Amino acid sequence: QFTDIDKLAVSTIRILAVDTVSKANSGHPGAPLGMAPAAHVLWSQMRMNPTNPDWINRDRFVLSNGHAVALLYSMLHLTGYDLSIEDLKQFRQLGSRTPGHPEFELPGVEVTTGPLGQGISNAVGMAMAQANLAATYNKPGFTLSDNYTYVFLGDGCLQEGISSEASSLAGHLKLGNLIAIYDDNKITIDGATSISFDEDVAKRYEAYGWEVLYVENGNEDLAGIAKAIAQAKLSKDKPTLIKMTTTIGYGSLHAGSHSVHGAPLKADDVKQLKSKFGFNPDKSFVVPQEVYDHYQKTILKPGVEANNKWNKLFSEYQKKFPELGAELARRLSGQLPANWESKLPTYTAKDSAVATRKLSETVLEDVYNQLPELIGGSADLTPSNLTRWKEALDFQPPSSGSGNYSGRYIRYGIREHAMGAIMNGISAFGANYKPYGGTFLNFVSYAAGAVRLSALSGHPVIWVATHDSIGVGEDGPTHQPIETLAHFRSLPNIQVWRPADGNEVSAAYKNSLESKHTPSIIALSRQNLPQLEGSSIESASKGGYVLQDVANPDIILVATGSEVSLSVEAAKTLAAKNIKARVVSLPDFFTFDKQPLEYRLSVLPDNVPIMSVEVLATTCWGKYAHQSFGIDRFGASGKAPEVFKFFGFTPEGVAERAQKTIAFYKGDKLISPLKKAF
Amino acid sequence: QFTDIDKLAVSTIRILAVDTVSKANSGHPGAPLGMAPAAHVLWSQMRMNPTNPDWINRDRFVLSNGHAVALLYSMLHLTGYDLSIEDLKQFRQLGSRTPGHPEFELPGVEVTTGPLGQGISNAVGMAMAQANLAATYNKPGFTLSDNYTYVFLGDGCLQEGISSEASSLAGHLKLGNLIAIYDDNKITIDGATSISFDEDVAKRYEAYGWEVLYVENGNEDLAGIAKAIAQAKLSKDKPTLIKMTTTIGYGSLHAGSHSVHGAPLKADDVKQLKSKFGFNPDKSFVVPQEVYDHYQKTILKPGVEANNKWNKLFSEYQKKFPELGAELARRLSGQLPANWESKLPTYTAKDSAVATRKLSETVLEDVYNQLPELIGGSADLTPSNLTRWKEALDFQPPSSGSGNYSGRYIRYGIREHAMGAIMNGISAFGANYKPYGGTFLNFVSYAAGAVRLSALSGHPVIWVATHDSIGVGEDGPTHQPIETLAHFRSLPNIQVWRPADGNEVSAAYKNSLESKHTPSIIALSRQNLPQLEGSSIESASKGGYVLQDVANPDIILVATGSEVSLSVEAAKTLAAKNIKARVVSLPDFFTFDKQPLEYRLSVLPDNVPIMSVEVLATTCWGKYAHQSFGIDRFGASGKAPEVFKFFGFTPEGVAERAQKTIAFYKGDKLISPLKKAF
Numbered sequence A, B: 001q002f003t004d005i006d007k008l009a010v011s012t013i014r015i016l017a018v019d020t021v022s023k024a025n026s027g028h029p030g031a032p033l034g035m036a037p038a039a040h041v042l043w044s045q046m047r048m049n050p051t052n053p054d055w056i057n058r059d060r061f062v063l064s065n066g067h068a069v070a071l072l073y074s075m076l077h078l079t080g081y082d083l084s085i086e087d088l089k090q091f092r093q094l095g096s097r098t099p100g101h102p103e104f105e106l107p108g109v110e111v112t113t114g115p116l117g118q119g120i121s122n123a124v125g126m127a128m129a130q131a132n133l134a135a136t137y138n139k140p141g142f143t144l145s146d147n148y149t150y151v152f153l154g155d156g157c158l159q160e161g162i163s164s165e166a167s168s169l170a171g172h173l174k175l176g177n178l179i180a181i182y183d184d185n186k187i188t189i190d191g192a193t194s195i196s197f198d199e200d201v202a203k204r205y206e207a208y209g210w211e212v213l214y215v216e217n218g219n220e221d222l223a224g225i226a227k228a229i230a231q232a233k234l235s236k237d238k239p240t241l242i243k244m245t246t247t248i249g250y251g252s253l254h255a256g257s258h259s260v261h262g263a264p265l266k267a268d269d270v271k272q273l274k275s276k277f278g279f280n281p282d283k284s285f286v287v288p289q290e291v292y293d294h295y296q297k298t299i300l301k302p303g304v305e306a307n308n309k310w311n312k313l314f315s316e317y318q319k320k321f322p323e324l325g326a327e328l329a330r331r332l333s334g335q336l337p338a339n340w341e342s343k344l345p346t347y348t349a350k351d352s353a354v355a356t357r358k359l360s361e362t363v364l365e366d367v368y369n370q371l372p373e374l375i376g377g378s379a380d381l382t383p384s385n386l387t388r389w390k391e392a393l394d395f396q397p398p399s400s401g402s403g404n405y406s407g408r409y410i411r412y413g414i415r416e417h418a419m420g421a422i423m424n425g426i427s428a429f430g431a432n433y434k435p436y437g438g439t440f441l442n443f444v445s446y447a448a449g450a451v452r453l454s455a456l457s458g459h460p461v462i463w464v465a466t467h468d469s470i471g472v473g474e475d476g477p478t479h480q481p482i483e484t485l486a487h488f489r490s491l492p493n494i495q496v497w498r499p500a501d502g503n504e505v506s507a508a509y510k511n512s513l514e515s516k517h518t519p520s521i522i523a524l525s526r527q528n529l530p531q532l533e534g535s536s537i538e539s540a541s542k543g544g545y546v547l548q549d550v551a552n553p554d555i556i557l558v559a560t561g562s563e564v565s566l567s568v569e570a571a572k573t574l575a576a577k578n579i580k581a582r583v584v585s586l587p588d589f590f591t592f593d594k595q596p597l598e599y600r601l602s603v604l605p606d607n608v609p610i611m612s613v614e615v616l617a618t619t620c621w622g623k624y625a626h627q628s629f630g631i632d633r634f635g636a637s638g639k640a641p642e643v644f645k646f647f648g649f650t651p652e653g654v655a656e657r658a659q660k661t662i663a664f665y666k667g668d669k670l671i672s673p674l675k676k677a678f
């Protein structure tokens, strides 16, 4: 039941968002103007505590079409979050809390968006995480988890393949608490949708297993939008898409035109809009008291009240179920179980040679019972990635017979990019979720859109990237990574681990799991690598360390992954010719760089030529080495041992190159590459 | 109408592909065994000349599910292409002509596949190119172009978002000559499809505007498969999907199990299969004469004859229409119009400051009529990328009213990955097609799956990547590239141009268009950059050159794109303090690296500190510079001038750093970074 105040509220939102775009003289006025009625209706009906944006059982809202931020920021201020008019007045300004696109970092903003297709897929992960939480802690009498996941999306999000991957998955999993409202406005940047997007979205979504509702008058039908959302909530075993038709830039003189998509409305156009809406065309950033009063009563106070009930029920739960309550309390506090690192495996050079890919599996089998917040999966490569623990139950709808929602292993299908985004949503949900997904290192590139966002936002997700090099073999160049690590090591805020043996894999996993704001990629071998004499979790945890030392080395050999052993071998060959080579291992650039200069300079000193060894791109090595032995061309289809020989990665092949580096520099004074002038 | 021979032929294919996988003890036997009847039926009705795999009007076949390559190689041998039994016997072996996955490089292999989702999308580009060629050259009496584009795909292909993007577009464009046959076998690596893929593919396809035919018995209904393909050929205004049901590993003792997906069948299982099909279980790579005789008759001879008529028609055409015939002859010969580079714009420092994004547009306007093979487009950013020439007609179905198939501007929609693959297909088609597409540099990453393949196969496609840095401004970090160029400069075989002014944009375009085996990415600014005194097409064309020189420089400043001018300004500030700085411009790592050592060492010599300047990742600069001034962290939402200042990129900010580099090295003898020891 809506009244004049609801209508007063809707104009305040449209005008506030417009004022905000115009003051910055940069921005997107269109969608905010067309989606305002939907926001009012939706937010009014959401269970959230603006004073605790962290409440675990809060209804969650994702703005997939991020360019419409002015709408998100307006709502945040009006409903009582930590966002003032002053903040809105510095929208898009260097240093403001109001950047051009929503960032995870701010309270009320659930994930960072801007790149189309990412928010809808993130919301899918958020709903999977809810389904899991509820199935794991809910007990009769204690419904600790039951929140909904709402999303706003545009034609752009529906055009990007990633949202298709996620919607396919979403429908298979039968995520009925996921409700998406689609801004069907018929406009995108180039112009009208018919110019390149004339497909039947409704029919495509039903094919996924989704429910589709329609709202023909999204510009004014508040009760219609209200009914569509309500019916949507009855869809228990089907996620819902509400195709709501609106007019881009509603109220504007150029409404319905793509000119109102991404430019501040012209001043006179703004004046007429205000007037039309009963506002003084001469004043800006005006919020009628009646609107603050309305949201206070409809949202803020009932939400606070709900958060309070939730806390009492939870305290009762901790009384009735001490083990579960303690666990949920801990996950909610964001701590990992005490001394969990104790269950991590350690080795000696006495043990057998294992593919780092299998050592990884061993780790999983060892910590899965220690970490109930660990939820894994693979994008159709479970047996190649070795990413499933034996006692795992799959995350599937109960009606499948293959598993249930309390399951902790996800079958992603061949959808790397969606996996990347779903993982971000699971991480973004809370309760200390530690998601990881597996694929071949070469195909993580398919997910670069999502991965960059794991780094930008700081979601500590884990990629179990197997088949890291030409060691892959016969599959060939289309499968063998070359530029992969160099790429990811150029991206800020992401660990790119490439462990050499058992001890190094445990360090890769301890640092990745202990991480709170940095995602990770663990590049694992297909082939067998031996256990090194000199490795350790403590030393590998530093990102880089001296594996084998000599007094007065003639050369320092730095390697990663499968090349550490080869370098160890090359050093034996070199010792025979009386050349002393110190061998350094560098499992992670990121972690190593984080160490204090004096440590790093103790591993990579002055006055010693340093040559790196890694069967991938050499373009990133200049920051640690003087000379580099790598592969700057695509691979080959052949038996792995033969492919290595063909590229010169033979012990004596490496030794020859160390000898050439010593000769080349003999007589020169050398500076560690670590040293910078400014 | 099929007979015993057709049935003899299908058994030979199944067994030859199995023999090939077993011999290599590596490979995928499953799909080839279930798809054998379809291939036989399809290839038998394709118009192709095994003797000229380049004939422009040949029906084209793409194996989207590349792992099934044993089937493709079998067909190529049997039908008469340059592939012998000996070649088959070295499948997946180092150096053979039979690698683990199909590579464009081989005759009869239309594009490289392996990464799922790529072949289907490539095939779409091939049909767009066909439709364009026909609408441009066909005249009444002369149907020079009318071939079909066939594709084989699996569940994996349909799960990857890229095939959805492409199928959406394909349906919009109404590409009726594109026929896709789907291997609906219910199995993927992890197991049954129901475990994660239970959507209604048929209904999802109709939603795109495609026609879907069904074939229930793909294991043996030759006539049904034949009917499905025939009916498919009648759908002129709709692309066709034929959901053909089969059993993975048909004939194998483990048929229908995911165990037959990617492992050579067990020896005893191979014996029973051969026996079952009337073959001696003890002999391998056996091709009944009757099989050779059959394909010679039904395919090789008819095809050679078809190619012969085609050539006569064509010669008559060049008589009747001299202009068009000469052009087609030239494009076919793969030459660019003579002295086309004369139309390329040149500038002087007296010209106005323009964003290299606009300078780009200017080039397009100038060479569009010189190059009929130039077909451009944008992924919904036509006005930001400035990718449209004014006299352009859009590539759309005639019934749209917005254009027609002779159009040369494509509206890709928000589908970066599909654009990348569609471009590879248009390039792959022939007739000297020169495709280029635009998007923001930061979003080319969404397309890294296709881009890598442009490099691996050598498709010389062009990416007009605008908004190259924090110069983007207010849009913020989600849009400002940081790791992008460092990533693509680590990928083999791809020019990554970052032109500074008008003259450098012309060299970017000249090198890009003249390229026959190397794709390109032209990173263009949003902001205005002035015309440099010292630039030129000739010098810029070498990838790197001395822009400003001095006798006995105290330092060499190496910059790219927007930073060259800043460096030029920093040098002016340094001159004032009597420090001589030579300023070098590096618009392309790739191009420069291809130059002779002597040239490169003349640009970057010994005994002079070299400091690089570029507002992106510093991780790749150690190959040309001693010290680097770059940005190794995400950007900021603010006015571009302010974001640059904030990051220290001001003239005096750069000058200060040069001064620090000089002091740091004062007294040391320095070696140019270009010098390698091995």
Ligand SMILES: Cc1ncc(C[n+]2csc(CCOP(=O)(O)OP(=O)(O)O)c2C)c(N)n1
Pocket (backbone or CB within 6 Å): A030, A031, A065, A067, A114, A115, A116, A117, A153, A154, A155, A156, A157, A160, A183, A185, A187, A188, A189, A248, A261, B379, B380, B381, B414, B443, B446
């Ligand atoms: C991956 C990605 N591709 C492209 C863009 C650039 N972009 C921003 S909004 C938009 C199109 C707008 O489409 P839509 O979702 O319909 O929004 P509306 O115009 O309705 O506001 C584009 C191309 C982007 N930010 N990210």
Ligand SMILES: Cc1ncc(C[n+]2csc(CCOP(=O)(O)OP(=O)(O)O)c2C)c(N)n1
Pocket (backbone or CB within 6 Å): A379, A380, A381, A414, A443, A446, B030, B031, B065, B067, B068, B114, B115, B116, B153, B154, B155, B156, B157, B183, B185, B187, B188, B189, B248, B261
């Ligand atoms: C981008 C990408 N990711 C993952 C894979 C690894 N892969 C290859 S085939 C396969 C899927 C099984 O595919 P399908 O097409 O389902 O198989 P078939 O019936 O022939 O077994 C997988 C996961 C791939 N080829 N490409």
Ligand SMILES: O=C[C@H](O)[C@H](O)COP(=O)(O)O
Pocket (backbone or CB within 6 Å): A028, A067, A261, A262, A263, B383, B384, B475, B526
């Ligand atoms: O979505 C819109 C874009 O981010 C923005 O409008 C582009 O502005 P510009 O093309 O002027 O850089």
Ligand SMILES: O=C[C@H](O)[C@H](O)COP(=O)(O)O
Pocket (backbone or CB within 6 Å): A383, A384, A385, A475, A526, B067, B262, B263
């Ligand atoms: O699609 C199949 C994969 O490329 C292959 O079967 C993986 O083999 P592997 O897991 O033994 O490396």
Ligand SMILES: [Ca+2]
Pocket (backbone or CB within 6 Å): A154, A155, A156, A183, A184, A185, A186, A187, A188
């Ligand atoms: Ca829209």
Ligand SMILES: [Ca+2]
Pocket (backbone or CB within 6 Å): B154, B155, B156, B183, B184, B185, B186, B187, B188
């Ligand atoms: Ca399959």
